[PDB]
Design an enzyme around this catalytic site. Structure first.
Site, PDB file in Angstrom:
ATOM      1  CG  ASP D  42      41.795  39.207 -11.718  1.00 44.01           C
ATOM      2  OD1 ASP D  42      41.733  40.182 -10.944  1.00 44.01           O
ATOM      3  OD2 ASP D  42      42.407  38.154 -11.443  1.00 44.01           O
TER       4      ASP D  42
HETATM    5  P1  LIG Z   1      39.372  35.152 -13.522  1.00 44.69           P
HETATM    6  O1  LIG Z   1      38.154  35.252 -14.407  1.00 44.69           O
HETATM    7  O2  LIG Z   1      40.413  36.195 -13.811  1.00 44.69           O
HETATM    8  O3  LIG Z   1      40.081  33.762 -13.879  1.00 44.69           O
HETATM    9  C1  LIG Z   1      40.807  33.053 -12.838  1.00 44.69           C
HETATM   10  C2  LIG Z   1      40.731  31.553 -13.086  1.00 44.69           C
HETATM   11  C3  LIG Z   1      41.161  30.801 -11.827  1.00 44.69           C
HETATM   12  C4  LIG Z   1      39.289  31.185 -13.400  1.00 44.69           C
HETATM   13  C5  LIG Z   1      41.598  31.133 -14.271  1.00 44.69           C
HETATM   14  O4  LIG Z   1      41.084  31.750 -15.430  1.00 44.69           O
HETATM   15  C6  LIG Z   1      41.829  29.655 -14.546  1.00 44.69           C
HETATM   16  O5  LIG Z   1      40.875  28.922 -14.785  1.00 44.69           O
HETATM   17  N1  LIG Z   1      43.080  29.217 -14.514  1.00 44.69           N
HETATM   18  C7  LIG Z   1      43.472  27.838 -14.752  1.00 44.69           C
HETATM   19  C8  LIG Z   1      42.768  26.875 -13.846  1.00 44.69           C
HETATM   20  C9  LIG Z   1      43.349  26.941 -12.458  1.00 44.69           C
HETATM   21  O6  LIG Z   1      43.899  27.949 -12.078  1.00 44.69           O
HETATM   22  N2  LIG Z   1      43.239  25.871 -11.678  1.00 44.69           N
HETATM   23  C10 LIG Z   1      43.755  25.797 -10.326  1.00 44.69           C
HETATM   24  C11 LIG Z   1      43.075  26.774  -9.420  1.00 44.69           C
HETATM   25  S1  LIG Z   1      42.319  26.054  -7.946  1.00 44.69           S
HETATM   26  C12 LIG Z   1      43.688  26.128  -6.875  1.00 44.69           C
HETATM   27  O7  LIG Z   1      44.816  26.236  -7.271  1.00 44.69           O
HETATM   28  C13 LIG Z   1      43.330  26.238  -5.444  1.00 44.69           C
HETATM   29  C14 LIG Z   1      44.463  25.796  -4.617  1.00 44.69           C
HETATM   30  C15 LIG Z   1      44.654  26.670  -3.401  1.00 44.69           C
HETATM   31  C16 LIG Z   1      43.433  26.874  -2.574  1.00 44.69           C
HETATM   32  C17 LIG Z   1      43.003  25.634  -1.871  1.00 44.69           C
HETATM   33  C18 LIG Z   1      41.920  25.864  -0.871  1.00 44.69           C
HETATM   34  C19 LIG Z   1      42.108  25.129   0.409  1.00 44.69           C
HETATM   35  C20 LIG Z   1      41.991  25.988   1.613  1.00 44.69           C
HETATM   36  C21 LIG Z   1      40.755  25.715   2.394  1.00 44.69           C
HETATM   37  C22 LIG Z   1      40.720  26.422   3.689  1.00 44.69           C
HETATM   38  C23 LIG Z   1      39.379  26.411   4.312  1.00 44.69           C
HETATM   39  C24 LIG Z   1      39.517  26.699   5.759  1.00 44.69           C
HETATM   40  C25 LIG Z   1      40.695  27.604   5.982  1.00 44.69           C
END
Ligand SMILES: *P(=O)(O)OCC(C)(C)[C@H](O)C(=O)NCCC(=O)NCCSC(=O)CCCCCCCCCCCCC
Ligand SMILES: CCCCCCCCCCCCCCCCCC(=O)OC[C@H](COP(=O)([O-])OCC(O)COP(=O)([O-])OC[C@@H](COC(=O)CCCCCCCCCCCCCCCCC)OC(=O)CCCCCCCCCCCCCCCCC)OC(=O)CCCCCCCCCCCCCCCCC
Ligand SMILES: CCCCCCCCCCCCCCCCCC(=O)OC[C@H](COP(=O)([O-])OCC[N+](C)(C)C)OC(=O)CCCCCCCCCCCCCCCCC
Ligand SMILES: CCCCCCCCCCCCCCCCCC(=O)OC[C@H](COP(=O)([O-])OCC[N+](C)(C)C)OC(=O)CCCCCCCCCCCCCCCCC
Ligand SMILES: CCCCCCCC/C=C/CCCCCCCC(=O)OC[C@H](COP(=O)(O)OCCN)OC(=O)CCCCCCC/C=C/CCCCCCCC
Ligand SMILES: CCCCCCCC/C=C\CCCCCCCC(=O)OC[C@H](COP(=O)(O)OCCN)OC(=O)CCCCCCC/C=C/CCCCCCCC
Ligand SMILES: CCCCCCCC/C=C\CCCCCCCC(=O)OC[C@H](COP(=O)(O)OCCN)OC(=O)CCCCCCC/C=C\CCCCCCCC
Ligand SMILES: CCCCCCCC/C=C\CCCCCCCC(=O)OC[C@H](COP(=O)(O)OCCN)OC(=O)CCCCCCC/C=C\CCCCCCCC
Ligand SMILES: CCCCCCCC/C=C\CCCCCCCC(=O)O[C@H](COC(=O)CCCCCCC/C=C/CCCCCCCC)COP(=O)(O)OCCN
Ligand SMILES: CCCCCCCCCCCCCCCCCC(=O)OC[C@H](COP(=O)(O)OCCN)OC(=O)CCCCCCCCCCCCCCCCC
Lengths: 102, 104, 128, 87, 603, 178, 87, 125
Positions: D42
């Site tokens: 994926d």
């Molecule tokens: P791939 O093509 O298989 O598809 C995966 C995705 C994610 C594109 C899905 O198809 C999708 O769009 N799903 C629904 C949307 C979604 O998942 N939204 C939420 C995702 S963002 C998220 O949850 C991030 C939160 C955790 C990470 C936060 C980052 C912070 C940390 C920063 C640290 C930097 C210094 C350490």
């Protein structure tokens, strides 16, 4: 995303052309055609580069720079007790008798 | 231009500009060799407050240390011949006020 | 949860923290498509001229010409003596002159008074 | 100073990294193995593969180009084109 | 006559010789770097000879050979002061330059303009020698500006790099502020002494005043990158590693300290300027060490260490110890040049990688480089019998037993501890642990040029402080009596820094992740000084340059007052005069009015 | 740099770019490989936990909160590859890149010093000059009446043709020109 | 050379202490001085002797111009341009 | 560094001495017979040796002897250890004399404070 067929085909053609261009950018074995036109090395380097400047500078200092007053000024030598002034044949006397400190 | 995208295929890669697009009135000021407005990890106000606090604290502590100096439990250094009166340029004609040092 | 980032003039807001980057309307997509179309048209024109084999010279840039003309030769015709312009011009063109005049006059008057009173150390000053 | 890269060396190194990946079966892996169509990965796995290639070859692949490299052959072609490898 | 002045001038002339040969096939071929290196080695020996002459009888001379011009009662002539400072600094600079040139022969092998690089290095060396041997303020200024512009040229060696160009311009800006101070000092000295030469300056200035000494202090701070004008030195690492090793850290950044040393009689006469020098040096060394302890770029860490050492030298000058500062200059030149060479070797071996977060395993990967860097870090922190011991320990002892600023003393001790800390950081993150570089291992340090250069600078990091300190006459009264806890203060703080840095580095192996602190962000971001002071003043100056001077004044109001108003008045008057309809009745009535006026109101 | 940008970044592209940035900054924080692997596995666990979400509004809100968290917790001095923008070796060799139009201003003696190269150069120049009309015709045939809507160029449809606007892309200077 | 007036340019007498070594080690300064005298001083002395012999072949003299005293501006009358010019 | 700084800054600065103003009491105050310090090296000898003005203290003769030793045995710089030790010991004695002066000033000041407090007590009652 991904590569569309048009993008993939154009990239393939450009890669072919670029690789052919680089292969042409290679050189030939004959390609540089020039016009028809160590103790010894260190010795010849030491005579000129060291011996000629020192001769020139010594000649310039001894007969031109020192021909004028105050051009070359030397800090006078330090005179210690119990010494011999060589210019006038003088004797600079010793100090007192040191009181012993243990 | 520092804020502009570096991975795009610009017509002027060093200036990060495209041919024909409108030019900012202050391009001469905003080139990559000059003033940068790119985002910073820390807020501008926080950076300014921290820098000002640091420099002000250092100046205040330097003044405090100046009015509370550090030294050693010793007396003044003693020099002979009226504290080297003639060696420091005293007038030979005039007679200095005598400075006498005693053993202890 | 976390401290917020406060943008400034020289510390502008990042594109990932812009609130408008997450509230997208269908009109915004149309505007973005129009911007991309304009950029693509300009890029196509530039690339045609740039890859023309018979071209020998400089591709004149109308944007560069407009910028240079506006910054130099277009200022006075579009100038109106508003109160803001009048005050700013008067200040930035007169205030420094009188400031420096007062400073130098005070300094020179003090020096001249000291010289007249004969209490200024002028010894060894034989190069003026 | 450093020895120049070649197409065979680039292919060997990228296949080495892919075979060291634990979510890819080495026996069914080839240079034309699509990561998602016939390898069952994926988007996150593809991003991790691209990052592994970046770490392996000591240079960064921009996200605009990284999202399109879905084959080992595509990765090889991209690396060779960027590094100016023609043999 | 005397083989002293002749040999000194001969060293200078043979340094200048290869510049003339740059217009020849020797410069066109690939033997030019080796030719320049051989010339520098011969100059080093021929300069060692007068050093032997001085250490015997303490002979000091001044040579005023060429008379340039007489400005009425002021005579400017080409004069050289071959005193203790000059005859001691010339051999050290030549030795370091020889080692750096061999290292550059190994390092810049693929550069198409290696001949030009060596020519620029030789020009910088010539300008530095002129600065060191200068006897008058004008010649000193010539050397000052020469080394400044050579630094500008060599920092931006890669002309296509915007970062290199802006770093060069920033260095020029800070050095120009220093030059403002220098020009103030020169003008005051000429006005109030009718002389630009040190002999008459010292004769006439029995009590040197605040204005000239502040000018000198400002020039020295600008040149040595003290607090307020410091950021140019860390940014000057955009150039090639040989440039950073030779120019900045070793010989150029000590120019301000050398200038303050040259006027030590005046510095002794004044007190407020001594206090200001002490405070500036203390704050500089503390701030630079605090920034260093958390950097990830090895070149930047070494640059901040150099800045901290310069601050320590300034502190030494502020406590009225000019000669200890010179000794520290020499020893620091030695081990700092060696450290920069080791860092450059690491960078070259790892394919232009300058990150300790990617360096690792180099203790066994690179044996000789590891040994040299360990020895250099031990000398830097003050190992009890290395080159850094004969300067730093005496400096700390003199600071402890002095009537100085308590805050400055505390900051000096903290700076020493932080020096140990960042040395530990470099060693730990570069040589210990497991590899973090890319799998293709291209590590190879078996080049004879690199090995010989590092070896020559390595013998001088162990057996040079001892010889130098035992072969110089006593220019200061020693501090024989002091408390035991003050005699070993430097060792205690150094060991404390070692232990604390090692503990905090060992805590990085734990599987615990925490967000950074305000103190960490302040220290890593260089105290926020480059951000604020490089964005706000520049923006305001470049905005007022366009909004006020160019547009508002030149293009609008200067045009409005004289030419536009007069033109408008003339146009209106012309329209009024020529707007006549040509009616005989009208202008004959005007004739009648004129006739009546002339007849009546004219007597 | 080789791909034409789109009008906008989709949600998948935004989250993937955020994931890559977070992994790179986490690697910058976690210097050692084992610690980096542990925390990268935790980060991907978070992303997979939020992976399945039908509500696009909630997904966008999660993305916004994640971006705020990343900006707060980013490394002040993140690792940058030497050749990447902002790296220590970025644009280092731009001063050594010289073009072929400079190459054709050479003196006849200089050109005679390299006889075989310039024959192939003349062949390339003839090949360029014999295709420009076909390239411009193909470009003007395939464009919409309004004009281009993207910066993507078509390939060569015919066998004897070349992809339009290829000269500078093909003959760009090498990454290590000297 | 000493072609200048000692009274106009005074110089105190030079007192050089005699060398009184207290060690058996040789003096590198003395050895290098001998080498310098053998290699530099003697050749430059010979060259100067030849040059001065050539100079004495044709010897010619130049003089210091003496200026007469003229009445000064105190004795000059007002608006007397010639006397003012001389003064 | 030391406890004297703490005593002066966080205690009775009147009882603690002032380094920039001491000595305050007469040198003969409390000393029925005190001997003036003796200088061995003369002004002319120091001038000829060209000692720095900070080095022309009462320990100058040992410094002159050390310089003469170092100049004579030039190639063997590891020679004048005895002269160096003699100079260091003379400087040590000078420093301990300075410390004695400081301590004398301190306890004379505290004795004056005790005497004036006793006088105040007597005047009060
Ligand atoms: P791939 O093509 O298989 O598809 C995966 C995705 C994610 C594109 C899905 O198809 C999708 O769009 N799903 C629904 C949307 C979604 O998942 N939204 C939420 C995702 S963002 C998220 O949850 C991030 C939160 C955790 C990470 C936060 C980052 C912070 C940390 C920063 C640290 C930097 C210094 C350490
Ligand atoms: C406006 C203020 C102006 C102040 C002016 C004066 C300044 C004085 C400076 C004093 C020294 C500062 C030391 C460094 C601070 C920064 C540390 C840092 O960034 O580390 C990261 C860096 C490593 O970073 P990294 O590996 O990249 O990873 C970072 C982490 O991911 C993430 O890193 P992290 O953030 O998790 O780690 C940092 C953490 C851990 O680091 C430390 O603890 C460092 C200090 C160690 C202890 C020092 C004191 C104990 C030892 C001495 C005790 C007394 C002895 C008395 C007697 C002496 C003589 C015998 O520290 C803190 O959290 C707070 C430290 C506060 C230090 C005090 C000065 C600043 C105060 C600012 C106010 C706010 C404070 C709270 C924080 C912000 C808000 C949340 O650390 C190091 O490299 C080592 C740092 C420690 C070196 C210590 C060396 C010795 C210091 C001096 C000891 C005494 C010597 C003798 C003195 C004279 C005696 C007479
Ligand atoms: C001597 C020459 C004087 C010329 C005066 C003149 O014509 O001024 C123009 C002006 C007329 O200029 P105007 O009518 O164009 O003024 C318009 C001004 N703005 C656009 C700012 C509103 O004439 C006068 O003001 C009459 C002056 C009469 C004499 C006064 C003494
Ligand atoms: C007398 C004969 C002795 C045996 C034969 C020696 C070799 C043959 C040549 C004669 C040499 C005579 C002695 C010279 C000094 C020898 C070394 C020595 O004594 O060292 C003592 C000292 C060492 O003594 P020390 O202090 O280490 O001794 C300690 C002794 N203990 C431990 C027992 C207490 O070393 C030096 O002085 C260093 C000298 C450095 C020289 C650097 C090179 C100079 C190169 C000059 C090039 C230019 C030349 C031409 C110049 C003119 C222009 C053209
Ligand atoms: C009296 C003379 C003036 C004294 C100083 C007044 C302020 C100087 C005004 C400067 C004018 C600005 C002109 C703009 C030129 C171009 C600027 C430029 O190139 O950009 C900024 C440029 C580089 O930017 P980077 O940070 O490297 O970003 C790189 C990102 N990769 O940085 C600069 O050169 C700006 C530096 C300005 C200096 C301002 C600070 C000086 C004030 C300290 C003075 C006090 C000294 C204390 C010592 C006292 C001793 C007694
Ligand atoms: C009073 C006693 C102390 C007096 C001061 C003594 C200083 C001693 C300095 C070193 C001693 C002099 C050594 C002479 C070296 C120069 C000889 C030379 O020109 O080259 C020969 C030879 C080969 O050179 P290449 O570049 O490889 O050329 C190859 C040709 N095919 O040179 C060498 O490499 C000799 C090896 C040197 C050993 C390392 C010496 C390290 C010295 C450290 C301290 C030196 C500091 C400099 C002065 C200190 C005082 C300020
Ligand atoms: C190849 C070299 C030639 C080989 C033969 C060796 C030459 C032997 C030298 C004998 C002749 C020397 C001689 O004639 O000396 C006098 C002659 C001129 O007479 P003056 O009285 O000094 O001029 C006064 C002007 N008002 O001096 C010279 O020509 C030698 C000058 C060489 C010194 C180096 C030149 C330095 C010039 C640098 C550029 C300007 C720098 C500015 C100086 C700043 C001073 C604050
Ligand atoms: C002083 C008391 C006596 C009173 C009379 C004063 C006479 C002397 C002052 C007049 C100066 C002579 C120059 C002005 C003459 C008239 C100029 C004029 O007609 O102005 C309108 C004129 C119209 O130009 P056109 O070709 O028709 O169309 C193009 C428009 N850009 O506008 C212009 O742009 C012409 C530029 C003329 C400006 C010349 C610069 C004048 C400098 C004056 C300095 C101060 C003088 C002191 C009085
Ligand atoms: C008490 C501490 C003072 C510290 C000073 C700090 C700097 C502040 C002073 C300069 C700031 C600018 C003030 C002058 C510029 C005029 C402001 C202006 O443009 O206002 C106009 C309208 O004009 C006014 O409002 C005038 C109000 C201020 C008048 C001040 C008194 C006038 C002074 C007369 C003397 C002028 C000549 C001065 C120099 C003479 C030689 C010394 C419209 O403003 P907008 O930009 O459109 O709207 C923005 C709203 N925030
Ligand atoms: C962390 C810092 C903690 C301590 C902060 C103290 C702040 C106040 C302070 O320093 O007071 C000391 C005070 C200053 O007074 P001062 O300005 O010297 O008055 C003389 C008039 N010209 O000092 C005095 O009034 C007397 C100072 C005596 C010592 C002088 C030594 C020289």
């Amino acid at each position: 995303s991904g590569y569309t067929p048009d993008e993939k085909l154009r990239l393939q053609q450009l890669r072919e052309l670029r690789r052919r261009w680089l292969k042409d950018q290679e050189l030939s074995p004959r390609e540089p055609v020039l016009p028809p036109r160590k103790t010894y090395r260190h010795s010849i380097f030491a005579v000129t580069h060291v011996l000629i400047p020192v001769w020139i500078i010594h000649y310039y200092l001894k007969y031109h720079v020192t021909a004028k007053p105050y051009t070359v000024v030397e800090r006078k030598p330090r005179i210690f007790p119990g010494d011999t002034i060589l210019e006038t044949g003088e004797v600079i006397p010793l100090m007192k008798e040191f009181p012993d400190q243990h | 231009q520092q804020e502009r995208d570096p991975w795009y295929d610009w017509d002027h890669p060093d200036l990060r500009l495209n041919w024909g697009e409108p030019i900012h009135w202050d391009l001469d000021m905003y080139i990559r060799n000059r003033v940068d407005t790119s985002p910073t990890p820390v807020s501008w106000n926080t950076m300014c407050k921290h820098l000002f606090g640091f420099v002000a604290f250092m100046l205040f502590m330097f003044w405090v240390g100046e009015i509370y100096p550090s030294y050693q439990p010793v007396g003044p250094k003693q020099y002979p011949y009226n504290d080297l009166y003639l060696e420091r340029g005293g007038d030979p004609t005039k007679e200095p006020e005598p400075v006498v040092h005693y053993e202890i | 949860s976390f401290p917020k980032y406060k943008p400034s003039r020289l510390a502008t807001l990042p594109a990932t923290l812009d609130p408008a980057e997450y509230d997208i309307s269908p009109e915004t997509r149309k505007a973005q498509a129009e911007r991309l179309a304009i950029r693509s048209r300009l890029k196509r024109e530039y690339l045609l001229q740039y890859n023309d084999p018979n071209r020998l010279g400089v591709i004149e840039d109308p944007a560069l010409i407009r910028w240079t003309y506006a910054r130099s030769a277009n200022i006075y015709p579009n100038f109106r003596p508003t109160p803001k312009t009048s005050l700013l011009g008067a200040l930035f063109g007169i205030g420094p002159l009188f400031f420096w005049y007062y400073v130098f006059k005070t300094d020179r008057d003090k020096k001249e008074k000291l010289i007249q009173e004969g209490k200024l150390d002028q010894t060894f000053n034989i190069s003026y | 100073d450093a020895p120049p890269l070649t197409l065979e060396a680039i292919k060997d190194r990228v296949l080495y990294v892919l075979k060291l990946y634990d979510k890819i079966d080495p026996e069914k892996l080839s240079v034309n193995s699509h990561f998602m169509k016939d390898l069952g990965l994926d988007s996150l796995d593809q991003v991790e593969i691209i990052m592994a290639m970046e770490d392996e070859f000591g240079f960064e692949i921009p996200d605009i180009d990284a999202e399109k490299l879905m084959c080992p052959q595509e990765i090889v072609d991209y690396i060779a084109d960027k590094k100016d490898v023609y043999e | 006559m005397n083989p002293f002045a002749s040999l000194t001038l001969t060293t200078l002339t043979i340094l200048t010789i290869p510049i003339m040969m740059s217009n020849s096939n020797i410069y066109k071929t690939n033997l030019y770097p080796n030719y320049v290196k051989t010339t520098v080695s011969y100059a080093f020996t021929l300069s060692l000879v007068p050093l032997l002459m001085f250490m015997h009888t303490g002979q000091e001379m001044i040579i005023s050979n060429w008379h340039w011009m007489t400005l009425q009662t002021v005579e400017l002539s080409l004069s050289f002061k071959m005193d203790y400072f000059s005859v001691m600094f010339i051999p050290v600079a030549l030795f370091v330059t020889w080692s750096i040139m061999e290292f550059s022969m190994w390092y810049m092998h693929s550069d198409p303009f290696i001949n030009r690089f060596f020519k620029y290095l030789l020009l910088f060396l010539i300008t530095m020698m002129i600065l060191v041997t200068a006897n008058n303020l004008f010649q000193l200024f010539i050397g000052w500006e020469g080394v400044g512009i050579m630094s500008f040229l060599l920092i931006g060696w890669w002309h296509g790099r915007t970062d290199a160009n802006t770093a060069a311009l920033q260095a020029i800006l800070y050095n120009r502020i220093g030059d403002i101070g220098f020009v103030l000092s020169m003008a005051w000295f000429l006005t109030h002494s009718n002389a630009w030469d040190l002999q008459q300056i010292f004769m006439l200035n029995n009590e040197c005043p605040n204005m000239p000494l502040i000018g000198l202090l400002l020039a020295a701070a600008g040149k040595s990158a003290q607090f307020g004008l410091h950021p140019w030195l860390p940014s000057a690492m955009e150039g090639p590693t040989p440039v950073s090793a030779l120019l900045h850290s070793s010989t150029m950044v000590v120019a301000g300290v050398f200038l303050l040393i040259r006027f030590y009689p005046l510095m002794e006469t004044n007190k407020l300027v001594q206090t200001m020098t002490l405070c500036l040096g203390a704050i500089t060394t503390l701030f630079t060490a605090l920034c260093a302890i958390t950097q990830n770029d090895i070149k930047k860490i070494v640059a901040f260490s150099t800045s901290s050492q310069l601050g320590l030298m300034m502190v030494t000058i502020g406590i009225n110890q000019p000669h200890l500062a010179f000794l520290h200059i020499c020893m620091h030149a030695f081990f700092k040049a060696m450290l920069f060479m080791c860092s450059g070797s690491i960078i070259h071996s790892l394919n232009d990688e300058q990150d300790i977060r990617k360096m690792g395993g180099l203790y066994k990967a690179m044996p000789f480089t590891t040994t040299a860097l360990i020895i250099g870090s031990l000398a830097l922190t003050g190992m009890p019998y290395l080159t850094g011991f004969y300067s730093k320990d005496l400096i700390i002892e003199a600071v402890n037993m002095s009537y100085t600023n308590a805050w400055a003393l505390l900051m000096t001790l903290i700076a020493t501890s932080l020096t140990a800390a960042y040395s530990t950081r470099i060693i730990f993150f570069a040589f210990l642990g497991k590899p973090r570089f890319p799998p293709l291992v291209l590590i190879n340090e078996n080049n004879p040029l690199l090995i010989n250069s590092i070896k020559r600078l390595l013998i001088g990091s162990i057996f040079a402080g001892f010889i130098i300190s035992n072969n110089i006459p006593p220019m200061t009264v020693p501090n024989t009596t002091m408390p035991l806890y003050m005699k070993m203060t430097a060792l205690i703080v150094t060991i404390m820094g070692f232990m604390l840095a090692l503990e905090l580095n060992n805590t990085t192996y734990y599987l615990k992740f925490k967000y950074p602190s305000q103190t960490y962000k302040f220290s890593n971001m260089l105290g926020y000084y480059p951000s604020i002071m490089h964005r706000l003043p520049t923006y305001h100056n470049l905005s007022m340059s366009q909004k006020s001077a160019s547009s508002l004044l030149d293009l609008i109001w200067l045009e409005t007052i004289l030419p536009k108003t007069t033109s408008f008045i003339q146009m209106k008057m012309s329209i009024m005069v020529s707007n006549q309809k040509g009616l005989i009745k009208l202008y004959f009535l005007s004739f009648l009015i004129t006739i009546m006026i002339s007849m009546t109101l004219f007597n | 740099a080789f791909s034409a940008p789109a009008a906008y970044l989709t949600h998948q592209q935004k989250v993937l770019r955020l994931y890559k940035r977070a992994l790179r900054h986490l690697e910058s924080w976690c210097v050692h490989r084992d610690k980096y692997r542990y925390f990268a596995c935790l980060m991907r666990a978070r992303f997979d936990e939020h992976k399945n979400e039908k509500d696009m509004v909630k997904a966008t809100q999660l993305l916004r909160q994640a971006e705020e968290e990343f900006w707060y917790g980013q490394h002040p001095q993140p690792y940058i590859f030497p050749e990447s923008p902002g790296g220590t070796s970025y644009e280092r060799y731009e001063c050594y890149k010289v073009p072929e139009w400079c190459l054709d201003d050479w003196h006849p003696s200089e050109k005679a010093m390299y006889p075989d190269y310039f024959a192939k150069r003349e062949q390339w120049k003839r090949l360029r000059r014999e295709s420009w009309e076909r390239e411009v015709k193909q470009l003007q045939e395939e464009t919409p009446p309004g004009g281009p809507r993207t910066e993507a160029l078509p390939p060569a449809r015919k066998e004897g043709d070349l992809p339009p606007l290829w000269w500078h892309i093909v003959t760009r200077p090498r990454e290590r020109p000297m | 050379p000493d072609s200048w007036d000692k009274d106009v340019y005074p110089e105190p007498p030079r007192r050089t202490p005699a060398p009184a070594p207290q060690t058996s080690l040789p003096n590198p300064v003395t050895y290098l001085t001998k080498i310098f005298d053998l290699l530099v001083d003697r050749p430059v002395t010979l060259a100067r002797e030849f040059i001065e012999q050539q100079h004495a072949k044709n010897r010619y003299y130049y003089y210091h111009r003496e200026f007469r005293r003229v009445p000064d501006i105190t004795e000059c009358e007002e608006k007397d341009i010639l006397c003012m010019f001389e003064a | 560094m030391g406890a004297h700084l703490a005593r002066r800054y966080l205690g009775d600065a009147s009882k603690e001495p002032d380094p920039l103003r001491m000595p305050t009491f007469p040198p003969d105050y409390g000393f029925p017979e005190r001997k003036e310090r003796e200088m061995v090296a003369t002004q002319q000898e120091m001038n000829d040796a060209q000692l720095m003005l900070q080095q022309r203290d009462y320990c100058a003769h040992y410094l002159i002897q050390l310089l003469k030793c170092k100049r004579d045995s030039f190639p063997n710089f590891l020679a004048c250890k005895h002269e160096q030790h003699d100079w260091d010991y003379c400087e040590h004695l000078d420093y301990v004399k300075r410390m004695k002066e400081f301590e004398r000033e301190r306890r004379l000041l505290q004795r004056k404070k005790r005497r004036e407090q006793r006088e105040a007590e007597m005047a009060r009652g």
